[PDB]
Symmetry: C4
Amino acid sequence: TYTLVWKVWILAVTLYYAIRIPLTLVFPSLFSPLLPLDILASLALIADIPLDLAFESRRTSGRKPTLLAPSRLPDLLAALPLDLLVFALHLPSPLSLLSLVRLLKLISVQRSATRILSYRINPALLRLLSLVGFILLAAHGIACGWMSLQPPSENPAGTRYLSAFYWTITTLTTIGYGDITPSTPTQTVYTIVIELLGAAMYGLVIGNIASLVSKLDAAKLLHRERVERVTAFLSYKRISPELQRRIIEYFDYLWETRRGYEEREVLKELPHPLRLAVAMEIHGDVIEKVPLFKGAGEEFIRDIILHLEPVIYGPGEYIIRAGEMGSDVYFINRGSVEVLSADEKTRYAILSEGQFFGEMALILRAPRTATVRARAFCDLYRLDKETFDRILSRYPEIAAQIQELA
Amino acid sequence: TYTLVWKVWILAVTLYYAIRIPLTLVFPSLFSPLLPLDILASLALIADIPLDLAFESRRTSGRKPTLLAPSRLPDLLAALPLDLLVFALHLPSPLSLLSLVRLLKLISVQRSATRILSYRINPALLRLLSLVGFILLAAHGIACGWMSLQPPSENPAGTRYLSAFYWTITTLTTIGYGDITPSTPTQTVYTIVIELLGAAMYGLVIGNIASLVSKLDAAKLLHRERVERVTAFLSYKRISPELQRRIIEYFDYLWETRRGYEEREVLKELPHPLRLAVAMEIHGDVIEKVPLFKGAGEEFIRDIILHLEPVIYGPGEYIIRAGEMGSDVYFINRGSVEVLSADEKTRYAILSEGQFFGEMALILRAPRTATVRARAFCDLYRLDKETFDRILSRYPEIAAQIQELA
Amino acid sequence: TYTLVWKVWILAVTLYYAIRIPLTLVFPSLFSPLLPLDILASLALIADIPLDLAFESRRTSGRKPTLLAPSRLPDLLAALPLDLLVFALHLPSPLSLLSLVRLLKLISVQRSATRILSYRINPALLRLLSLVGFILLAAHGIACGWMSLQPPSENPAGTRYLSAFYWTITTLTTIGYGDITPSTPTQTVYTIVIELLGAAMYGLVIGNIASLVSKLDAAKLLHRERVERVTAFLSYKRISPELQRRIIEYFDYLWETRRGYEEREVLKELPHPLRLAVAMEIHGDVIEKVPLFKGAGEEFIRDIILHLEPVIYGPGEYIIRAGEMGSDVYFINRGSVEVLSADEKTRYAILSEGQFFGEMALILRAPRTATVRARAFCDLYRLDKETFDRILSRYPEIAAQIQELA
Amino acid sequence: TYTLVWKVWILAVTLYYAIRIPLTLVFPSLFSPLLPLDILASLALIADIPLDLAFESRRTSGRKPTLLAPSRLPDLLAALPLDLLVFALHLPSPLSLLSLVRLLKLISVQRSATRILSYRINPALLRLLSLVGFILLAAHGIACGWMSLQPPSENPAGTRYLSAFYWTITTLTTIGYGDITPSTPTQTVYTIVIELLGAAMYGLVIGNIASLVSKLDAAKLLHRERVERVTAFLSYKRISPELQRRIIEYFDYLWETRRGYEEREVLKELPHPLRLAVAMEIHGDVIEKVPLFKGAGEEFIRDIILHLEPVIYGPGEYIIRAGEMGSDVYFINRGSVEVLSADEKTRYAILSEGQFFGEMALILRAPRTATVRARAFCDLYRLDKETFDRILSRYPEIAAQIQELA
Ligand SMILES: Nc1ncnc2c1ncn2[C@@H]1O[C@@H]2COP(=O)(O)O[C@H]2[C@H]1O
Ligand SMILES: Nc1ncnc2c1ncn2[C@@H]1O[C@@H]2COP(=O)(O)O[C@H]2[C@H]1O
């Protein structure tokens, strides 16, 4: 949308004001040669007042003020051509400061950037970058103020501005070389207030950096503290080192795969329709592929899919042991698994991605026919007999169908 | 209440003490011309001791001490007219410091402001502002102490105080120009202790700023990390980009509407009566408007309303598909929805705010008569058949009424 | 226990070492006059090695090393009388530094203080205070090192130590006056390493302060953000201002009473026996006072009490409305409540702390006889009919007793 | 694996580049005598480009780019021998800076260390250490840049490098002695940009330190705030000091044993197979030791074990009181317990680690035969009658067996 390039243009005009206004306050001779752009800067800026008023009124509706409220005032009062008149008639120093009203546009530009950005940019990083930009603009303004109090001299404007910017950076960053310092009480008061301002600005920078880096690896720290808690509890319970190693490597696999997030908790953030869509896409072509499920309507399938629960079986450990009272069908979703004889002397089968096993427990209460043992991290899904019956009761005809299949 | 203006007056008197006491310690000639206000300052301050004792005793009751406990002592010992006597009889320097006992009122004024404010003011911002005020008062006191150690000279009191405040600000902010520095061992020791104090104060400022800005966008970061977790889990599960886009825009709608808060968790903070009131106001004139509900007493309505659960259906996705085994009535609460034929070739109806659909599943087990599909984000509420029966069992007469309606 | 005074004595001896060793390294003449205390310091310190080994071995058992492991080594190698020999034979500078091995006792004293304290002292505040103490000791040591590199001069030892401490404080606090600076390459290298160390130490101070103050009002911020979330969700749902005000004042009452903690979640931290004890003490002499409960054994009472759930009814709102299907007994626990006629034209009763109402719903399904309305914040407890029956089924004889009472 | 020593070698070569390139930029005479190692440095570095491409392609598969993407570019463009050619033909200053392209290897070495480490090293501490290393390398580079702008002089290269490093450390650490400062506009601009960079670097150091120490005792603070909440809620409920003391010591035991972690929540992080393994190892040889359990298959045992719930009975408080309606078997797991007569006048038994009691309630509804009272913190497990029946229903034959045992 072309509103973005307009916002960028308004940002450039605001930066032009922030640079020029204090720079031409100390250098009146700089006013007239840049007068065309100022007109270009002014006609644009006032034009932004109603135009942007449209772009914000047409979202979320509810009418918008144009002469009221704490909001929309910093733009309104910054629209006035106070700078043009005050420079044109050469108003004296203590009243020429009214030219700074253009700088009030900054606190509206920051709000605009808070929604032009902050989709693709971290909000803490966005706040830090806005603070850095404001600090640089303030450093320019403070250098101009420092120049305004220096005794007049024949030094080139460039070198005196460089000295003023050197001093203001030295102060704002609290480095404080002190090679150039106030020589007069007014410079002393200005330096005191600038020292307070610089301490506040550097504290803001440090606080924003800490806020950023304190959450820079939130997932990693959340997983690590979870592992630490689990390991400490196991060590208290005097669990053998081998089982702790198996748990450690399970957590390592879980982190390397899905960054430590619990599978069941992630599919709890989503609403029911989105959970249904996600589950139907995860379990696509693996649930209608079941023989005892085939032929049932998709309202049965969608009810079945929402109740499958994830379970990460580790490598080499048992999922099913023959002769037990098996009561849970399974569906493989990332790993592979081996079906072995009751004595594990021979391998019946190898199953992989999109395959399933344990169907018999759905149709019959018979004990398990064979052992099932994970080769890799199986990363599969489970469905209990009792839940299957509960969700089957609402579909009597397919219950009779599966009873006939038995 | 007039107690607020009294507290503000006591704050002003305490600031007057904090300004004058160290300033007149180095300038004895300043004592006598301000003596009237000191009397005004003193008669007020002692008067605050019992008076405020009332205002705190009449809340939470339980009696209050007046010569005991760590609390209420900083006010008591600060009530004493030590400053008046010590200035009146010109006690020498090492014992004149007892005039500072007025400054103990600050740690009671801060406690008072912690409850006069902190309703309408962020507690972290309140602590930061109190720290800044205390730092400025301490800067004044430290400038006075620095003046007290300077060799006597004919410089105007104003310019020497300005130099002392310049030095103390330069030190407390760790900028350290070093253009003015200790010339004598006593000034060196004072500068060492003031350097430690200033480092501690600036560390406190930075820590408070970090604590503030680390929670300045808690809701935004909590929503963003939730979105990141969901997206990472989806990407691990190899979900298609279009479904991820639909989930992303659902989360965007949820944030723009209710700032990322889960609807069910917010109505869990409230107690049962407040949950009932909030639910009755959300679902007002949308639940008695139901035909199969009309005529039932309000104890049935209030039982029904507490069990409605929220579900945000996304735009263009199905809520009801014809021919299924529908078992859930619905109530629209923000969006709009279209009722379409079983082949979606023609639109039966458009429903909006305060409308409902799916009534049939309450009265009959018949399959759905038509499809229902969200136009916008529907943002609606659902009620299951089984929950409806469970809460209906306690009202047999209206169960018979609805059975007759069928 | 006398072990505390022994630990305090060992702390004092360690501080004596930390002060004297670098101070006498630059001042050899200070060694001999303090030799007695050094013997006193040494005979004690070695004596601490086995003695404390007992005090830690007799807790948690499991045997302890005495010549092994990363732990217990800093104490062992600090026990050696390296300082006494190195000062007695006047070993030259580059090898005299071995006297510093006494300072290794600090990292054991800190560990000891981490368990002598940290019961009654905040762990973050304890870490900050230990850091401050270590920083002051390091400042003394660094001042001694700075003196060691200064060209020899006839200045008094006191004033040169004061200048060195001034410089080291100026550097460690990053203030950096620069009135005294390296004059030689070795002093330059020492200043570089001390600048790195001071930057690290001041960063540690700031980080510890931020960690402390970022959790200084955890309860207040946790309650405030909960209130903000609730209010934002209500405002999205367009709830009337009066209901929002009632919710705001409910949250204010909850904070002022129990600091924002959910009553049900606090009695979830405790184990079953402690939950039972706490509940029996909360509901003492209010549950046997019930007429339809009197005479039952205390195994019935203790089963009843664990199932009472808390509910804070706000002032002026209804708890019971006459003619409804009441199914929940109530017990008042902080507030008061008024029993009013079905038309609220006359007050039947006022009930307060330790009183109860709604008994009839336990014995009979009859509709409520009268309205019950909170005067204050009632802050009471509730018991459902269905839960009462479920916990009654295990006591058939008292069920028959209450059936006879009906 | 030998890949680790190769990564360490590549790290050493990258550090060699970071040290030499800016050092030989200001000292051309240093180029030729180190030319052999440069060849050794270069032939290795290019060799790393495909070789490491293998080591990362053989994990997680999916093919890898070699001329594309933001990743793998900093290594590619750093492989080029720009330094060798630019030094060999003595390209002038403003274009000789292209030799710095070797330094782009740093942002790949950091990524490599992020996975060579971060298993055994805290990620926040790892980030802090990487930042410190980068800051030291940048300090060397900035010292070289400062030397590049100094007017030429006959001072030894060592002492001028020492002065430059002194200045850059003084600036980056914000200490700012100001004994050496820019004398020319170009040095002023360089100092301004270096002041900004140093402020940013020191803010990064402080932020990383705060992020580290704000989570340095997460478990301790999480337990302490839980204790504070519990104690505040108890004090609001006016619970007696003795019960609060018992709760305080229960929490102290819980912290000293398992660091404040809830037993039930830790065995919720693990998946079902790992939960089963951990439970089977915790309850090994204590569940088959039961007489009414012996003889049942291990599918019954494994179903029983998953349902045992932990409960920490405090010292001296009752677990079982005679004559009640006992309905829960128990298993001791850390502590000891005393079985006492119904009048507690005589002790029937003392049971300890691995023992059990309360078996009768499983087989019969008879009231408890004797009292059971904890000596120490019992730290045991419980199993309800109703849960036992629910998990028994799936094994009818052993239900008949236990019915015969009765
Ligand atoms: N003509 C219509 N106008 C409005 N709503 C309709 C119309 N026809 C069907 N519906 C609704 O569409 C719903 C879909 O089938 P249900 O049985 O769920 O209940 C149906 C009605 O509530
Ligand atoms: N005169 C009274 N004095 C005290 N309590 C009363 C009186 N009349 C009614 N109640 C209580 O008011 C309650 C409201 O009806 P319930 O059936 O819930 O049980 C009723 C009694 O507990």
